[model samples]
Target: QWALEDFEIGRPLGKGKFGNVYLAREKQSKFILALKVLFKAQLEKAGVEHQLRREVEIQSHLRHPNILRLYGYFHDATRVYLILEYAPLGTVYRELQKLSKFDEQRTATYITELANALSYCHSKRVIHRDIKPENLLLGSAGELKIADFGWSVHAPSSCGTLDYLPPEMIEGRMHDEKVDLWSLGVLCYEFLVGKPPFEANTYQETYKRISRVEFTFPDFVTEGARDLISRLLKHNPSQRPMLREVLEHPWITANSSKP
Candidate 1:
């Protein structure tokens, strides 16, 4: 366990709905970290105390290179602070915004990394319900990191972001780890197309499109990329490719720089 005085807080790393993250360094070992400060009242008001607890419990146990590490946590009367690994390059969402969209090689590389990480998570009986650019970060070496676990669960159940939600979830049916596969499909489309496959002018329209698995690929998208995205965005959860299959997909192997 660490105390507030043990860390020297610097500039703001980012701000969130419930709190802010700061660049911090431990005075004793001079190790760099991100200090995520969440207000107790806000958590209580939002009724997400258990969610926060689960997020910490799940994130702390994960050790994948593509997953951010939670060192430990501490709290005072008003706020709880989480000690986290600092990703110097910041959120993947920021990078996407700057670049408009990622190149094929870059998108394939990130998808491969995410698949490996998600496979590890599923093996541990953990399901990351939320998988989006906003929840992803880039390390100093440009590796993708699954940085948020707030919506994750030990699994046997689920919930996720609107654009990434599987049809089963939208229809109020039982769901499992396969939901991540759906999100991965949506992410792959967003990565290559600069927008989600089911995106629409209204939320209801988006829901309709997702339920119908209705989307079209631009002419610029290669057939290989289109095939992979089509397979992933299936209306049925079981129809989506497994993480292993995703890694082995022809497009992934063809576009990714790594073996």
Candidate 2:
């Protein structure tokens, strides 16, 4: 068990809805880590202690190079703390802001690593309901890590971002792991093209397009890349490519090498 006083908190690494993540170093081991500080009062008031509990439980057990590691957790009277891997390269969202859109190779490298990470999570029956640039982090070496597990659950029936939600979720239909595939599809498109496939002028229009699963690739999107995103974004859940299928897809394999 880690006492809050055993670590030196440095600076803000990032911020989330429930709390902020900070750069921290353990006193004994001198290990660099991210200390996520969450307000206990706010958590109980929001009726989301279960959510925090689930995040801590799920993340602590999941171990993968591409999945942000949760080393441990401790709580105090007014706050809860999570000790996590320090991803010094920060988030993909920041990179996206600078680049506008990633090149095909860059997109494929990120998606390939992310797909592998998700496959591992699924094998353990974990479903990361939210999969977006904002939730993806990068290590100093440029390795991608799925960072935020706020909406993740083990075989969750429902939960996710509206922009990335699968049709089944929008229609109130039964859903499974395939929902993540749809989100990944949206992310892939957004990574290469600068925006999600179905973004529109307003919430109503965006929701309508998402519910209908309506999207078209720009002329610049290549045939192979387009094919993969298409298979992953199918309206029918069963029609979406399996994670393994995505890993083996031509576009993914062809452009998957890291720089």
Candidate 3:
């Protein structure tokens, strides 16, 4: 039951549509934490309080180094507060901005590591429907933590994020773990190129670009890496690479296969 003054803001991490993610250190424990403050009225207005409850329930059991840890959640009559593990290095998005872009090797590392964790999340029947650089963070030790499961649900139907969503999501179907894999592909591309593909002028244009299924790697992109990206972008979720299959692919494992 810490009040707003119980913590000190070290820096401005970032802001979201509904909440702002901050780097805060507890006054008592001197421990660092990430505090997410979402307006109760907004959530209740959306009639998604049950979805928020599901997020709490699912997160209670998900204790992984790669996944962001929920310290706990509580709400008074007015607002809801979710306490989370703080990653001081900030988000992959911030890193991308600082670097102005990421190299191919860096992009591969981030994508492979995140996909590895998503595989576990999927195995546990947890679909992180929103998978993007903004949702991934790095710990003090430089480990990735998937954060902000606000859109995450046990079996979510509309947990889709626009640019990161798969075709099935647009088709009004329940997306599975494969949707996460698709988002990862988009993220990997963005990390390398410093922007997302299908930067359509409008939502319709974005949908049209995705439906066209047109992805091309510039001549500068290596053949193997480009091939891997192509495989990930395949519209048919069934045809997409499973997490295990992806790891085996030379992008992750060190073997005979070229990347």
Candidate 4:
């Protein structure tokens, strides 16, 4: 039942599909938080009440520096609320709009962060089916926080963000942890050029590019990074690097080298 006015801008930190994010100032305490408000009727109609509750339950148990922190939540009539860490910089998709592309070092840092996070998620049997630039949120301290767990699952599924899916999915590939790696490949390329690798004038064109694994790196890209990305984009998903190998790649190691 909270409305636009219910939030105090300096207090309400953000807004999403169900409700607004708020910053709270009570007496002497100052806090930044996101308020997700969902309706009982919506959950009932969608038959996802259990899923919603599971999200709340599992998310509470999920503790990782790379994942957003969920603190507390409560509700009133007409809404179920969730309090989450505030993402001040928003999505990397928006970041691309401003910077066009990131240098190799910056791109490597983000990729490694994502790899570490995904590795943790997978280890706990949490499959983050939705992996895309939009789901990668920049935390208040510039760290990356994976967001949007709507499609996440404890068991793998052949479902995820379309633009970032692996070649095997459309070609009847089995779902597994490798899907996240495929997404990582796309994200790495995206950070390098500020454009989706499968980008085209039309959706069909884009799909074709992904299916065909058609992409090329510019001369600006170092051979090491290009080699890594190409490996990640391999048509046979198994050929892609595992997190253990990915984080160890020459390009990533070089990028993370102490300044």
Candidate 5:
């Protein structure tokens, strides 16, 4: 229902293969947001039209505090526009890089918020296949907001980064929502150590390491945190702890106050 004239475009926020993101505000509501502009030709040419459609489908309806809000979509002849909630602080990826790594409390807080978001997603039968710092955004208060969904289980793509790919994905085995947990486990390790648990010099070795679920705990990480990550990085997805169980784990709850 919104037209181009209704928004006040500020500046370019980011860029991607298909298009650019702009800082936009609805003139009538004075509400700030991000406008994701995707080129129709570029999407179709890249054979990712379905991915865009699926991303819209899943994101628009998903309502969670930690999940990015997709207000709606409208398109012109040559491009598609998605109205998204603006994350003022930018992505966790950039922030994490600046800090090198996080302390236990900050890492625990992010993990807890993300776990709540993923648990909500799973309840809706929506599995987020890609869960990484890059996909996590920060609100004005620095709260977590899961941003991208190019690789949700429903919208399959080619293999993603070897670092986050679980054994089920690497081995071509059938996977479900549990794959997100594995990624979360890797994310947890990276959050505290500044690197993924399975990184290697070669792609093949990385894949092999992931397949074996082989990783050693760094002395820098607390034992309780190591126990939590170990349970999640299991080679068998079935062996991974459920989100509820993870939420209740002592490490996660240590710093999390119940609302």
Candidate 6:
């Protein structure tokens, strides 16, 4: 059990549609964390109370290094506060935007870590519906941490960012954990190419391209990378490679710095 008084809030970390996050310290234990303060009225207004609840429920139970930790949460009459692991370096999206694109080594390293994290999530029967750069954070060591569980669920779900959504979801068909593989392929492409594979001027066109698994690689993308991306971005979900296979893929094995 915790109360608002238990924390001594510091600088504002960031803001989102539903709330603001602050750097906070647990007064007694001297532990630092990011306190995400969400407004009850806003959440209720958006009719996403269940979504917030589900995010809290799923994220609090996950304990992987590449997945941000949800230490705990508390509520007052008008607000809910989530105590989250503080990733000091901030979001991967910001870094990607500044750098334009990542080198093959960095891309491969991030992919390996993400594949390992997703494998753990699958073992626990948790599906992270959203897996884009915006949802990832960087630790002090520059390691990737999946920071948002706003679209995560236990085993069954849909609803991800448009650029990352799989054809199964766009087609309004039933989807399984394989959806994450499609997002992985998209993420890999974006990391190297600095843009999503199926991006188009209009939503309908993008959906059409994604449904057809229609995409081309830039001449610079290595053969290993092209092979992995092609294999994962298949229109048929089952045709996508398993997470373990992803970790073992030649591109990942050759370029990843970590063991």
Per residue, candidate 4 scores C-alpha lDDT tens digits across 95-180 of 87889899888899898888888889888888776678777789767778887666676755553335787776766657777878
lDDT of 6 by residue, 4-53 (tens): 99999999988878899999999999999999999999999888888888
Steric clash count of candidate 5: 0
Off by over 4 Å in 3: 1-10, 155-161, 254-259
lDDT of 3 by residue, 1-259 (tens): 6576677876656765556666788898898887777778788777878767876777767977789888777666777777788887888988988997777667767776787788889888889887888889998877778986767765545533367777888777866777887887788778767777655667887787776765666566666667677888888988888887777777555422222
Worst 10 residues of 4 by lDDT: 1-10
TM-score of each: 0.96, 0.95, 0.89, 0.83, 0.93, 0.94
**lDDT of the candidates, in the order given:** 0.89, 0.88, 0.75, 0.75, 0.88, 0.90
- Candidate 4 regions with alpha-carbon error over 4 angstroms: 1-29, 39-51, 159-161, 170-173, 257-259
Best by TM-score: 1
* RMSD to the hidden true structure, all candidates: 1.5, 1.7, 3.1, 3.6, 2.1, 1.6
Error of 1 at 124 (Å): 0.5
Worst 10 residues of 5 by lDDT: 152-161
lDDT string, candidate 5, 1-259, tens digits = 8777889999988888789999999999999999999999988888887777778898999999899999999999898999999999998999889999998888889889999999899888788887888889999988999988767754233245699889888887788888989988999899999989999999999998998888998788998899999999998888999999988989888966454
Clashes of each: 0, 0, 0, 8, 0, 0
lDDT of 3: 0.75
Please provide, for model 2 over 1-259, each residue's C-alpha lDDT reduced to its tens digit, 9 standing for 90 to 100: 6799999999998886678999999998899999999998878778888877888888888999999989999998888999999999989989999999999899999989988899999999998878888889999889999987877776757543478888887788888899899999999999999999988877778789998889999899999989999888899998998898998898898888854
Better of 1 and 6 by TM-score: 1
Clash pairs of candidate 4? 11-22, 11-23, 12-22, 12-23, 13-21, 13-22, 13-23, 14-21
Candidate 2's error at 105, in angstroms? Answer: 0.7
Q: State residue 130's C-alpha deviation in candidate 1, in Å.
A: 0.2
Error of 6 at 251 (Å): 0.9
